[PDB]
């Protein structure tokens, strides 16, 4: 009572199993009908391959009856419902038509098996599915195009030989030569030459003897008109594939050229201009061009949360003020983190300016330099956090909200920063968290010994009724 | 009557008018250049030229019975339509197209195709039909290919007529380039004359070559022009097909914009395989089931009034079934529809867990959600499509024992599509309707009280403290003002 | 150079070019020696010398230049000699270079030499970074690819002709004339799918001609696609400018906008395109990193803004925020930057051009001409809504590019800097009290 | 582009004749035939054949006579290599033009296809589905696909104001409240107007619906209608405005910013809407004008009889923490 899942791996393995008989029938049936040496010479081979193809054809009917479908988001495993979904469709008519024998209407001849060509839907489904699964989208795409062109060329080669046989072998210069002649008589020459004739005709090359009869003029004109669309399709598919490979570089190069034009037009200094060009080369070479937020907006909101948690929650938990934090708040802070990139020599923050954000070092090395910018008090590596006190909302301390130290980027660094508003927005839902986070900041300033505990109580937040209660002493 | 140009009747007439124009463009040049075709089937041309002239005349009748949009409303006035049409340059071309050459007909010949060459001027009516077909067809790329193939044949058919006309002027059988002598066993027939001439131009214009070399200046100059046309015509074929192919590939890319970029990023950021598998299986679900993701971005294509109508027609039926929105105005419910945003959950995903902050109300468009236990194995109840949960959380009703946290765990069985209304989004909408807030809060009281989630005495203590403070603050507002009025 | 930075060292770019030339020589000469059996001794004397020179270039590249390359490690560059050498030694580039110099008279004895293609790719990246309008080099590279394909096709055709027998059939090479030119002629006529060749008679000839024609069809498709991509990338900017101008003119024609206003819009479009190269610069600025955009704004405007007497004593971060909120507006000649009696709500910085403060008994008489770098109208930022009215006409003299900071932008900045807000209010009171 | 091809073809024709002269006329089959022969030796024949040879060789379509000498082989190889670069440049230039002309339709067809996918996905009813399809046909037929705001966003504010004055200032000065408005304010208001297009039978506003916008009819006819849509009280033509009092924040209004009439569009109408917020933003810098606008609206509301209300009714939404702030602020 097994039911196949269309998104599963076993269903895709079946698509390859059914597509091979379907592709074999589209290639070999017309060749055996037109080239009589192929059918008679290898009869014992075709008896095995016809039986194997037939058995897989009937097996596809059973698989179609046991393939589930999503109804209300749940795969349907009821045998009755799976049968009613398939039987009333058009594909059931085409599937049964491919398998019903033509015993009523020579049974060994390939012409009675031409109903097998109606099973083409499994072949196109397999190519559609493989395009998504494959790791190389462009190698598969050029291989898929060649296969379609090769089958059309092979079909036209068999049509030309059948037209030559109907008109007469060697009766004029256009048709295939006399097969009574041993030079043209064997099967290897007549298939390859007709393949050679078909390729030249369908790719707008020509180089073939001109037609003689009026029926021959019509066939070549039709082939030239079809072949001008075949060549346009080949050119269009290769040209469109080329555009896709260079699409990412061309978008980035157009950005660099526009920035370069801005710097010369605006008389940007040579030192600043050379650094910006140098910065852009590092981003492309290290594959840091793409924006994380632009990448992940296509994901669903819940699945984007688990992607962001797997990257930032480990480093955010190591922050001292967030050590006692609830796991619910830590999730919201992770989504609120926004990335920053700096070049060598860039100042993350300077002494005495307003600090409104905390930074976490994803990558790169940061130095706590002095005012000179060359004497390094401390070294900050990946996972380090600075500015943690600044995001905490407390009335101005002895030091205040302003920064204490000059943080400079020694090399290119990636930082993730949590802003003041972002922390304040997130903590509104969690009022207990606000008390805990302020308490660690109260204790951290106690570690540095900036203010007294009762002096910090003026800086700390108070309840609205107690603040009114403190004022209730004043009104009287 | 008066036809509407956007109507089906006017479109059906445009497709009718294609055939007289296509007949005149194709047959008249062939009859002029092939004397065997004109003289051999002279009876059939008298019938078909009368039919084309009749349908050309009926086109001018339809032009006088076609309305136009002035001030956005269709004008059905016969006098105003007629006064508008005769001023147009199309009227001049319509008159010239059917302009009688019958007076000068006999002098050149009893029946001459060149005299009917003025019928070519109705070609703008054919381009209008092709433009109108492209707008409303289901297959815009398949029609563009077929329209290009029609353009290819007409140019090749025209070149074949010019080859036969020049080869007749130079004399048949003079050299290998011109059309062979009719004394040859096959070349006396009219069918061979067209088939050989069409095959000659098909060799050139499709860049095959394989033609006999010319022998004189007229044949040299014809070849130089044909080779240049074959090069410029070939580049038009590649460019049109490469644009069709690029339009096809981009369209499927638009449905699923970024798959490789996410997959590449997850490799660079070393996302764990289990989570990486889930993203890959998510993208497989989109391709197989052809689901859409940027539901909001598609609706930005529509104008704001039409976007609201589309949104209301989809979401108003389920929004009205909410217990707290039962006593709401028609205008208020339509404003709440636009604030709904879609959420999609994979199987086994948790919409909400017990103890989590809840500030949203989820409405189940499709899929099944289960109220699982703390362990998660047993299901208390199953919520199907059209149902909802979390409507108390967006209300902010005083005296609730909920605690602004989720009461029970909700798990998604299968793929579930939900629309959520946040507490903030309801709050901005409610600002325009102050009286509507009070009804929802009152409705919120009843739901909590029936399930015993509101202690009245605990609620009253919150209310009494607030109203005493509100009374005190008004006194405090007096106290600050009474002090400051007498302080100064 | 004690250490070499691959990205910016022109010497390393030149050395990469020489390595590319050596690899190109090996890649061209292996098929020639494989296909063509006999060469004159004078050819041997210079071919062997060039082969030794190319092998010496390979040896110098693997030993000196690649070990002398500094690299970014965790965001920080490494200049240490041992670390640089070890980084090169533990690399796929080193593996490929050693495989290229693998030893393995035989023409295929030098077949490992084709593995120095990573140097070619690096040289391509360096060149497209160094030179503007890289589509010219892309065209040159595609042409070189086509020439090498035809060279390989000629070598294969000579191999086939000599293998079947020279002069055996009409399809194979006769043995008359220069072997390379007659084989290159066949290669061109087949890989371009021109045709016009003797027909293949034997099965081997038919198969060879079929595959050579199919490959030629796809080679022609590749060339057409490359040229189409080059043309699109070249003309994208002009296409965008023309489409924007056409949309604007179509709108103005639909709404019956007068010809004078249409002419002014068209003149602005033409001048802005020809000068700036883009219609709006903010679309470019919001794509850059925040630090890069801030640095560019600082470099353009910080020296001018910091010298403004109104903003002295304010926070440097607040000045930086104003620099980020400055917007660039181009004024047509004789345009009114300020009109007397109009509301003043902006501060203008003259990036380019001149403005004239018209005044006098007659009026419309130049009193002072302000050149580039001037800042005027800064007092209107401190005023309350409706507080400031312009007191004189300021008229642009020629095409003037101004940087404008709106009062709303300054008010939105000042909420984050209460100290500077209080200082600016105090300065506003002092300006009001001292002038009155 | 065609002229460049002709100059190259003509130049290559002359080089072929010069090469044939250098090698010798008639020495072999590849070069031009003998000049001394009267069949070949005249200027009309030798230029036209060489023009034919150059076109036949560069375009790589037809078959040129085979070369005989190694010097001749090199020239034909050079022409074929040059003709490949010319032909690939031709297809790239023409192919890029065709993409540019089709780009407007191609991006419009993607919008319809994206919307058409949404309606079948969300099971939009056929009455509403055909309404959307009919709307997109109106946009393409009358060429209204591109948004006005996106068209003029690159223009400077001075040029944008100059365009907007010529479109809306005549109709905006006909509004009763904006009768005596200052010239500076009127430029601010016409920049705030947003285009709106309504299908036939669409309701601009309904009785009892909250109204925060004022509409000016650029084109089209609107009808004031009863609860049953067919019966119409009055007709609003192009240049008329309604909802002017909704954007004014009068202190006391019996209306309560709710529409008192049903307005319906007889056909497609282009409306420009001035919102309540946009009027507030415009009059921040014109405080005296704001007072005159409210007084004029108050006078109009007196004539209707819908002015006097909320004498003792006031709404207070200050937070308990924010109201506590003033008590702290007053003490310092
Ligand atoms: Ca050919
Ligand atoms: Ca060809």
DSSP D176-200: STTSS--HHHHHHHHHH-EEEEE-T
D48 CA distance to ligand 1 centroid (A)? Answer: 22
Instruction: Judge: C228–B209 Cβ closer than 8 Å, yes or no.
Output: no
Mutate to test the interface with D, among C141, C153, C265 (most CBs of D within 10 A): C265
Query: In chain D, which residues have their Cβ closer than 8 Å to the Cβ of C279?
Result: 154
List residues bridging with B361 in a β-sheet. B421
Q: How far apart are CA B269 and CA A314, in angstroms?
A: 13
Contact between residue A322 and residue A330 where contact means Cβ atoms under 8 Å apart:
yes
D279 Cα to chain C: minimum distance (Å): 14
3 state SS of C357: strand
Tokens of B459: 């609620």
B354 φ/ψ sector (left φ>0, alpha ψ -120 to 50, else beta):
beta
Counting every residue written for chain A, the total comes to 476
How distant, in Å, are the alpha carbons of C134, C189, C215, C332 from that of C222?
19, 17, 10, 48
A236 CA distance to ligand 2 centroid (A)? Answer: 16
Q: Tell me which residue in A221, A290, A311 faces B261 most closely, judged by beta carbons.
A: A290
Q: How far apart are CA C422 and CA C405, in angstroms?
A: 20
Q: Which of A112, A144, A142 is nearest to A23 (CA)?
A: A144
* C92 labelled ligand-binding: no
| Residue B249 contacts A where some CB pair is shorter than 8 Å | yes
A232 CA distance to ligand 2 centroid (A)? Answer: 12
CA torsion, points C330, C331, C336, C337, in degrees to nearest 10? 30
Q: Which residues, including other chains, have CB under 8 Å from residue D113's CB and lie 6 or more apart?
A: B251
D184 Cα to chain C: minimum distance (Å): 7
Q: How far apart are CA A420 and CA A357, in angstroms?
A: 6
D313 Cα to chain A: minimum distance (Å): 27
Query: In chain C, which residues have their Cβ closer than 8 Å to the Cβ of A266?
Result: 296, 300, 351
Q: How far apart are CA C347 and CA C327, in angstroms?
A: 11
- Main-chain dihedrals φ then ψ at residue C400, nearest 5 degrees: -110, 130
Q: Tell me which residue in C184, C250, C256 faces D77 most closely, judged by beta carbons.
A: C184
Q: Tell me which residue in B5, B239, B305 faces D91 most closely, judged by beta carbons.
A: B239
Q: How far apart are CA C134 and CA A254, in angstroms?
A: 11
What is the full DSSP assignment across C49-77? HHHHHHHHHHHHIIIIITTTB-EEETTEE
How distant, in Å, are the alpha carbons of A31, A101, B148, B155, D90 from that of A107?
17, 9, 44, 48, 55
Q: How far apart are CA D218 and CA B211, in angstroms?
A: 64
3 state SS of B469: helix
Tokens of C129: 């970074």
Tokens of D75: 């020239």
Residue whose tokens read 């449905």: B255
| Residue C436 contacts A where some CB pair is shorter than 8 Å | no
Contact between residue C332 and residue C402 where contact means Cβ atoms under 8 Å apart:
no
3 state SS of D102: helix
Q: Which residues, including other chains, have CB under 8 Å from residue B303's CB and lie 6 or more apart?
A: D135, D196, D197
* Chain centroid, CA A367 distance in Å: 39
Q: Which of C193, C158, C205, C160 is nearest to C177 (CA)?
A: C158
3 state SS of D216: strand
Query: In chain A, which residues have their Cβ closer than 8 Å to the Cβ of B192?
Result: 214
Contact between residue A359 and residue A416 where contact means Cβ atoms under 8 Å apart:
yes
Query: In chain C, which residues have their Cβ closer than 8 Å to the Cβ of A361?
Result: none
C181 Cα to chain A: minimum distance (Å): 22
C194 CA distance to ligand 1 centroid (A)? Answer: 5
How distant, in Å, are the alpha carbons of A371, B9, B10, B247, D150 from that of B6?
74, 9, 7, 26, 27
3 state SS of B37: helix
- Main-chain dihedrals φ then ψ at residue B478, nearest 5 degrees: -65, -45
D166 Cα to chain C: minimum distance (Å): 7
Q: How far apart are CA C162 and CA A437, in angstroms?
A: 86
3 state SS of B373: coil
Resolution in angstroms for this experimental structure?
A: 2.9
> Residue D25: exposed, middle, or buried by beta-carbon count in 10 A (0-12, 13-18, 19+)?
middle
Query: In chain C, which residues have their Cβ closer than 8 Å to the Cβ of A406?
Result: none
Q: Tell me which residue in D91, D320, D327 faces A471 most closely, judged by beta carbons.
A: D327
C190 CA distance to ligand 1 centroid (A)? Answer: 10
How distant, in Å, are the alpha carbons of B239, C137, C230, D101 from that of C142?
20, 9, 11, 28
Instruction: Judge: D320–A464 Cβ closer than 8 Å, yes or no.
Output: yes
Q: How far apart are CA C289 and CA B243, in angstroms?
A: 35
Q: How far apart are CA D299 and CA B295, in angstroms?
A: 47
- Main-chain dihedrals φ then ψ at residue B315, nearest 5 degrees: -110, -10
- Main-chain dihedrals φ then ψ at residue D306, nearest 5 degrees: -115, 35
Contact between residue A235 and residue C221 where contact means Cβ atoms under 8 Å apart:
yes
Tokens of B385: 């499509």
D53 CA distance to ligand 1 centroid (A)? Answer: 15
DSSP letter (8 states) at residue D205 = E
Q: SS3 for chain A, per residue?
A: CCCECCCCHHHHHHHHHHHHHHHHHHHHHHHHHHCHHHHHHCHHHHHHHHHHHHHHHHHHHHHHHCECCEECCEECCCHHHHHHHHHCCHHHHHHHHHHCCCCCCCCCCHHHHHHHHHHCHHHHHHHHHHHHHCCCHHHHHHHHHHHHHHHHHHHHHHHHHHHHHHHCCCCCCCCCCCCCCHHHHCHHHHHHHHHHHHHHHHCCCCCCCCCCCHHHHHHHHHHHHHHHHHHHHHHHHHHHHHHHHCHHHHHHHHHHHHHHHHHHHCCCCHHHHHHHHHHHHHHHHCCCCCCHHHHHCCCCHHHHHHHHHHHHHHHHHCCCCCCCCCHHHHHHHHHHCEEEEECCCCEEECCCCECCEEEEEEECCEEEECCCCCCEEEEECCCCEECHHHHCCCCCCCCCCECCCEEEECCCEEEEEEEHHHHHHHCCCCHHHHHHHHHHHHHHHHHHCCCCHHHHHHHCCCCHHHHHHHHHHHHC
List residues bridging with B379 in a β-sheet. B372
> With a CB-CB cutoff of 8 Å, which residues 71-110 of chain C face chain D?
none
Q: Which of D8, A146, B241 is nearest to C225 (CA)?
A: B241
Which chains are within 8 Å of D by 3+ CB pairs? Answer: A, B, C
D149 CA distance to ligand 1 centroid (A)? Answer: 54
> Residue C46: exposed, middle, or buried by beta-carbon count in 10 A (0-12, 13-18, 19+)?
exposed
B275 Cα to chain A: minimum distance (Å): 7
Q: Which ligand has its closest atom nearest to the C-alpha of A206?
A: 1
D2 CA distance to ligand 2 centroid (A)? Answer: 20
Backbone gaps in chain B, preceding residues (C–N over 2.5 A): none
Q: Tell me which residue in A189, A238, A342 faces C222 most closely, judged by beta carbons.
A: A238
Contact between residue C238 and residue D142 where contact means Cβ atoms under 8 Å apart:
no
Q: Tell me which residue in B209, B210, B238 faces C224 most closely, judged by beta carbons.
A: B238
What residue of A is the nearest CA neighbor of D96? A239
Instruction: Judge: A218–B289 Cβ closer than 8 Å, yes or no.
Output: no
Instruction: Judge: D63–B246 Cβ closer than 8 Å, yes or no.
Output: no
Instruction: Judge: B209–C224 Cβ closer than 8 Å, yes or no.
Output: no
Instruction: Judge: A192–C207 Cβ closer than 8 Å, yes or no.
Output: yes
Tokens of B15: 């497709």
B193 CA distance to ligand 2 centroid (A)? Answer: 25
Instruction: Judge: D285–C265 Cβ closer than 8 Å, yes or no.
Output: no
Contact between residue B130 and residue B147 where contact means Cβ atoms under 8 Å apart:
yes
* Chain centroid, CA D88 distance in Å: 34
What residue of A is the nearest CA neighbor of B212? A210
Q: Which residues, including other chains, have CB under 8 Å from residue D42's CB and lie 6 or more apart?
A: none
Beta carbons within 10 angstroms of residue B452's beta carbon: 8
Contact between residue D259 and residue D213 where contact means Cβ atoms under 8 Å apart:
no
Mutate to test the interface with A, among B151, B238, B340 (most CBs of A within 10 A): B238
Q: How far apart are CA B234 and CA B208, in angstroms?
A: 11
- Main-chain dihedrals φ then ψ at residue A295, nearest 5 degrees: -70, -45
> Residue C90: exposed, middle, or buried by beta-carbon count in 10 A (0-12, 13-18, 19+)?
exposed
List residues bridging with B422 in a β-sheet. B360
Query: In chain C, which residues have their Cβ closer than 8 Å to the Cβ of B210?
Result: 195
Q: How far apart are CA A9 and CA A129, in angstroms?
A: 11
Q: How far apart are CA D10 and CA D62, in angstroms?
A: 18
Beta carbons within 10 angstroms of residue C234's beta carbon: 17
B402 φ/ψ sector (left φ>0, alpha ψ -120 to 50, else beta):
alpha
Backbone gaps in chain D, preceding residues (C–N over 2.5 A): none
List of long-range contacts for C99-104, beta carbons under 8 Å, 24+ apart: C100/C58, C101/C55, C101/C58, C101/C59, C101/C62
Contact between residue B276 and residue B266 where contact means Cβ atoms under 8 Å apart:
yes
Contact between residue D253 and residue D307 where contact means Cβ atoms under 8 Å apart:
yes
Q: Which of B342, C102, B279 is nearest to A299 (CA)?
A: B279
3 state SS of D233: strand
Instruction: Label the pairing between strands B409-422 and B341-345.
Output: antiparallel
Question: Where in B335-378 does DSSP place strands (E)?
Answer: 341-345, 350-352, 360-372
Contact between residue B393 and residue B408 where contact means Cβ atoms under 8 Å apart:
no
What is the full DSSP assignment across B153-215? HHHHHHHHHHHHHHHHHH-TTSSSSSPPPTTSTTTTSHHHHHHHHHHHHHHHHTT----PPP-
C196 CA distance to ligand 1 centroid (A)? Answer: 6
Contact between residue D7 and residue D1 where contact means Cβ atoms under 8 Å apart:
no
Query: In chain C, which residues have their Cβ closer than 8 Å to the Cβ of D143?
Result: 250
Instruction: Judge: B310–D119 Cβ closer than 8 Å, yes or no.
Output: yes
Instruction: Judge: B282–A217 Cβ closer than 8 Å, yes or no.
Output: no
Mutate to test the interface with D, among C185, C254, C345, C355 (most CBs of D within 10 A): C185
What is the full DSSP assignment across C380-402? GGSSPTTT-B--SEEEEEEEEEE
Contact between residue B329 and residue B436 where contact means Cβ atoms under 8 Å apart:
yes
3 state SS of D250: coil
List of long-range contacts for B285-290, beta carbons under 8 Å, 24+ apart: B285/A7, B285/B346, B285/B415, B286/B255, B286/B256, B287/A132, B287/B256, B288/A6, B288/A7, B288/A129, B289/A70, B290/B255
| Residue A269 contacts C where some CB pair is shorter than 8 Å | yes
Q: Tell me which residue in C195, C224, C228 faces B209 most closely, judged by beta carbons.
A: C195
Instruction: Judge: C264–D162 Cβ closer than 8 Å, yes or no.
Output: yes
Q: SS3 for A30-84, per residue?
A: HHHHHCHHHHHHCHHHHHHHHHHHHHHHHHHHHHHHCECCEECCEECCCHHHHHH
| Residue D92 contacts C where some CB pair is shorter than 8 Å | yes
- Main-chain dihedrals φ then ψ at residue A114, nearest 5 degrees: -70, -10
Q: Tell me which residue in A303, A310, A430 faces B346 most closely, judged by beta carbons.
A: A303
Q: How far apart are CA A334 and CA B238, in angstroms?
A: 51
């Amino acid at each position: 009572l097994f039911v196949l899942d269309p998104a599963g791996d076993w269903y895709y393995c079946w698509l390859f199993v059914i597509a091979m008989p379907v592709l074999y029938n589209w290639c070999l049936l017309v060749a055996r009908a037109c080239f009589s040496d192929l059918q008679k010479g290898y009869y014992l081979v075709w008896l095995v391959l016809d039986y194997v193809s037939d058995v897989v054809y009937i097996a596809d009917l059973f698989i179609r009856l046991r393939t589930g479908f999503l109804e209300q988001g749940l795969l349907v495993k009821d045998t009755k419902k799976l049968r009613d979904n398939y039987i009333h469709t058009l594909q059931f008519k085409l599937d049964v038509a491919s398998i019903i024998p033509t015993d009523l209407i020579d049974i060994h001849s390939p012409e009675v098996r031409f109903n097998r060509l109606l099973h083409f839907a499994r072949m196109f489904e397999f190519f559609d599915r493989t395009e998504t699964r494959t790791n190389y989208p462009n190698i598969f795409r050029i291989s898929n195009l060649v296969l379609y062109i090769l089958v059309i060329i092979h079909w036209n080669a068999c049509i030309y030989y059948a037209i030559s046989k109907s008109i007469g072998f060697g009766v004029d210069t256009w048709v295939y030569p006399n097969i009574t002649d041993p030079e043209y008589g064997y099967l290897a020459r007549e298939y390859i030459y007709c393949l050679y004739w078909s390729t030249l005709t369908l790719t707008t090359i020509g180089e073939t003897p001109p037609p003689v009869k009026d029926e021959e003029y019509l066939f070549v004109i039709f082939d030239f008109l079809i072949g001008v669309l075949i060549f346009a399709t080949i050119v269009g598919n290769v040209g469109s594939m080329i555009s896709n490979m260079n699409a990412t570089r061309a978008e980035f190069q157009a950005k660099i050229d526009a920035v370069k034009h801005y710097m010369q037009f605006r008389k940007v200094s040579k030192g600043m201009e050379a650094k910006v060009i140098r910065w852009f080369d590092y981003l492309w070479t290290n594959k840091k061009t793409v924006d994380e937020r632009e990448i992940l907006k296509n994901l669903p909101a819940k699945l984007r949360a688990e992607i962001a948690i797997n990257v930032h929650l480990s480093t955010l938990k190591k922050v001292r003020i967030f050590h006692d934090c609830e796991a619910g708040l830590l999730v919201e802070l992770v989504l609120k983190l926004r990335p920053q990139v700096f070049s060598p020599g860039d100042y993350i923050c300077r002494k005495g300016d307003i600090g409104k954000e905390m930074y976490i070092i994803k990558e790169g090395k940061l130095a706590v330099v002095a005012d000179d910018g060359v004497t390094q008090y401390a070294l900050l590596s990946a996972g380090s956090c600075f500015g943690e006190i600044s995001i905490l909302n407390i009335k101005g301390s002895k030091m205040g909200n302003r920064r204490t130290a000059n943080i400079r980027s020694l090399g290119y660094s990636d930082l993730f920063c949590l802003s003041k508003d972002d922390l304040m927005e997130a903590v509104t839902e969690y009022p207990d968290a606000k008390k805990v986070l302020e308490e660690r900041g109260r204790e951290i300033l106690m570690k540095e010994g900036l203010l007294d505990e009762n002096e910090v109580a003026t800086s700390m937040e108070v309840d609205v009724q107690e603040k009114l209660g403190q004022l209730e002493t004043n009104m009287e | 009557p008066v036809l509407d140009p956007s109507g089906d009747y006017y479109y059906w007439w445009l497709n009718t008018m294609v055939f007289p124009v296509m007949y005149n463009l194709i047959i008249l040049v062939c009859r002029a250049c092939f004397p065997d075709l004109q003289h051999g089937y002279l009876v059939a041309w008298l019938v078909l030229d009368y039919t084309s002239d009749l349908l050309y005349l009926l086109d001018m009748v339809v032009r006088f019975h076609t309305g136009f949009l002035e001030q956005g409303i269709l004008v059905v006035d016969k006098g105003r339509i007629s006064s508008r049409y005769v001023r147009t340059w199309s009227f001049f071309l319509d008159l010239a197209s059917l302009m009688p050459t019958d007076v000068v007909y006999v002098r050149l010949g009893p029946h001459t195709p060149t005299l009917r060459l003025n019928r070519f001027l109705r070609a703008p009516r054919l381009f209008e039909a092709f433009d109108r077909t492209e707008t409303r067809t289901a297959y815009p790329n398949a029609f563009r290919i077929a329209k290009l193939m029609l353009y290819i044949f007409v140019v090749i058919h025209w070149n074949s007529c010019l080859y036969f006309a020049l080869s007749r002027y130079l004399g048949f059988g003079r050299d290998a380039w011109v059309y062979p002598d009719p004394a040859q066993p096959g070349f006396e027939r009219l069918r061979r004359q067209y088939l050989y001439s069409f095959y000659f131009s098909t060799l050139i214009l499709t860049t095959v070559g394989d033609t006999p070399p010319p022998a004189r200046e007229e044949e040299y100059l014809f070849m130089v022009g044909d080779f240049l046309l074959a090069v410029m015509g070939f580049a038009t074929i590649m460019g049109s097909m490469s644009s069709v192919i690029y339009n096809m590939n981009t369209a499927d890319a638009a449905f699923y914009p970024d798959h490789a970029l996410v997959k590449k990023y997850m490799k660079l950021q070393h996302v764990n395989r289990k989570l990486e598998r889930r993203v890959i299986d998510w993208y497989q679900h989109l391709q197989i089931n052809k689901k859409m993701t940027n539901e909001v971005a598609i609706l930005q294509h529509l104008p704001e009034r039409l976007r609201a109508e589309v949104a209301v027609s989809v979401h108003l039926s389920t929004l009205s079934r909410v217990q707290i929105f039962q006593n709401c105005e028609a205008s208020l419910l339509e404003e709440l529809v636009l604030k709904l945003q879609p959420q999609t959950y994979s199987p086994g995903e948790y919409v909400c867990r017990k103890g989590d902050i809840g500030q949203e109300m989820y409405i189940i468009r499709e899929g099944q959600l289960a109220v699982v236990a703390d362990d998660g194995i047993t299901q208390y109840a199953v919520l199907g499509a059209g149902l909802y949960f979390g409507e108390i959380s967006i209300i902010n009703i005083k005296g609730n024992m909920s605690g602004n946290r989720r009461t029970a765990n909700i798990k998604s069985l299968g793929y579930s599509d939900l629309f959520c209304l946040s507490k903030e989004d309801l709050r901005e909408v409610l600002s325009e309707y102050p009286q509507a807030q009070t009804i929802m809060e009152e409705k919120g009281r009843e739901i909590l009280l029936k399930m015993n989630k509101l202690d009245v005495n605990a609620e009253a203590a919150e209310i009494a403290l607030q109203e005493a403070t509100e009374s005190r603050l008004r006194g405090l507002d007096q106290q600050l003002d009474d002090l400051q009025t007498k302080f100064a | 150079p004690q250490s070499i930075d691959p990205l910016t060292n022109l010497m390393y770019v030149l050395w990469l070019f020489f390595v590319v030339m050596a690899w190109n020589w090996n890649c061209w000469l292996i098929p020639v020696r494989w296909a063509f059996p006999y060469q004159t001794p004078d050819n041997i004397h210079h071919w062997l010398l060039m082969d030794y020179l190319c092998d010496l270039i390979y040896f110098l590249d693997i030993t000196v230049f690649q070990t002398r390359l500094q690299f970014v490690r965790g965001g920080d560059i490494i200049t240490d000699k041992k670390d640089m050498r070890n980084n090169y030694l533990k690399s796929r580039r080193f593996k490929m270079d050693l495989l290229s110099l693998l030893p393995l008279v035989n023409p295929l004895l030098r077949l490992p030499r084709c593995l120095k293609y990573m140097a070619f790719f690096e040289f391509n990246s360096r060149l497209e970074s160094i030179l503007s309008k890289a589509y010219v080099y892309r065209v040159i590279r595609t042409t070189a690819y086509l020439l090498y394909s035809l060279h390989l096709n000629s070598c294969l055709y000579y191999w086939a002709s000599a293998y079947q027998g020279l002069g055996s059939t009409h399809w194979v090479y006769d043995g008359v004339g220069n072997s390379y030119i007659r084989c290159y002629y066949f290669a061109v006529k087949t890989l371009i799918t021109i045709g016009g060749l003797p027909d293949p008679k034997t099965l081997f000839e038919i198969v060879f001609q079929l595959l050579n024609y199919f490959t030629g069809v796809f080679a022609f498709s590749v060339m057409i696609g490359q040229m189409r991509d080059v043309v699109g990338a070249a003309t994208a900017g002009q296409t965008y400018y023309r489409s924007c101008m056409d949309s604007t003119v179509k709108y103005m024609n639909f709404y019956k906008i007068p010809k004078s206003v249409q002419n002014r819009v068209k003149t602005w479009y033409e001048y802005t395109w020809h000068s700036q190269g883009m219609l709006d610069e903010s679309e470019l600025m919001v794509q850059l990193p925040d630090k890069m955009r801030l640095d560019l704004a600082i470099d353009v405007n910080y020296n001018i803004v910091s010298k403004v007497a109104l903003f002295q004593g304010c926070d440097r971060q607040m000045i930086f925020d104003m620099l980020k909120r400055l917007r660039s507006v181009v004024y047509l000649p004789n345009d009114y930057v300020c009109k007397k009696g109009e509301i003043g709500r902006e501060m203008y910085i003259i990036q380019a051009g001149q403005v004239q403060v018209l005044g006098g008994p007659d009026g419309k008489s130049v009193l002072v001409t302000l050149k580039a770098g001037s800042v005027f109208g800064e007092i209107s930022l401190l005023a309350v809504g409706g507080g400031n009215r312009r007191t004189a006409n300021v008229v642009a003299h020629g095409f003037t590019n101004l940087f404008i900071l709106d009062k709303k932008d300054l008010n939105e900045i000042l909420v984050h800097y209460p100290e500077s807000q209080k200082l600016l209010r105090k300065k506003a009171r002092r300006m009001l009290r001292s002038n009155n």
